[PDB]
């Protein structure tokens, strides 16, 4: 059961805490890179005890594509111990929203959401840009619409519509914690 090659991406951290990763991705020969490419294949993120972590763009990114969600303390565990330890204990099982009961990230990855929805994001948004809620989209099988109407582009699917039919974009934010696509009408705003 042997396979892809780690290269790894860090959330969350601060400079020191990057900087302590920079070093021990060198010592191992781990792939490190600033942005979430095609090879991203960890994503390494700051928890709390209970392996419970902020939520990041790089963190939804990272569970929208089944990856490998770590807590840094696989990183500050692994170097008081002077070995390269399993990744597999040091899964984040949460953020600070869902807690640490639902294993999002798990279940994510195991299994591997918005197929066959079509949902356009309207421009004003107050988090993270209008860009990267579109890729998140996408990478969870949905029909990204880039306009309105929809004209010939249009699948059938009554569209969702982000906000700030008309849903909060919190409703995708928990639905990828959770990796479940959620009931929509705890998120309509109108």
């Known amino acids: 059961r042997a396979e892809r090659d780690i290269s ?18 060198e010592k191992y020969r781990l792939a490190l890179t600033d942005v979430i490419t095609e ?6 993120i700051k928890t709390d005890a209970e392996f419970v972590c902020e939520r990041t763009l790089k963190y939804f990114l990272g569970i ?16 008081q111990e002077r070995k390269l330890l399993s990744v597999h204990e ?42 990267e809620l579109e890729r998140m989209l996408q990478l969870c099988g949905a029909s990204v619409v880039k306009e309105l109407p929809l004209l010939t582009r249009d699948t059938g699917a009554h569209p969702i519509v982000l906000v700030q039919r008309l849903v909060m974009w919190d409703w ?5 914690s959770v990796y479940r696509c959620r009931d929509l009408d705890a998120y309509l705003v109108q």
């Open 64 to 79: 929208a594509g089944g990856k490998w969600i770590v807590s840094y303390s696989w990183v500050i565990k692994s170097i």
């Open 39 to 44: 090879e991203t294949t960890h994503v390494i």
């Open 172 to 176: 995708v934010l928990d639905s990828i």
């Open 90 to 131: 040091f899964e984040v099982k949460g953020d600070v929203v869902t807690g640490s009961n639902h294993q999002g990230p798990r279940r994510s990855r195991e299994s591997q959401l918005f197929e066959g929805l079509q949902i356009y994001c309207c421009e004003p948004f107050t988090n993270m840009p209008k860009d």
């Open 8 to 25: 790894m991406v860090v959330s969350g951290l601060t400079p020191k805490e990057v900087m302590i990763v920079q070093k021990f991705a």
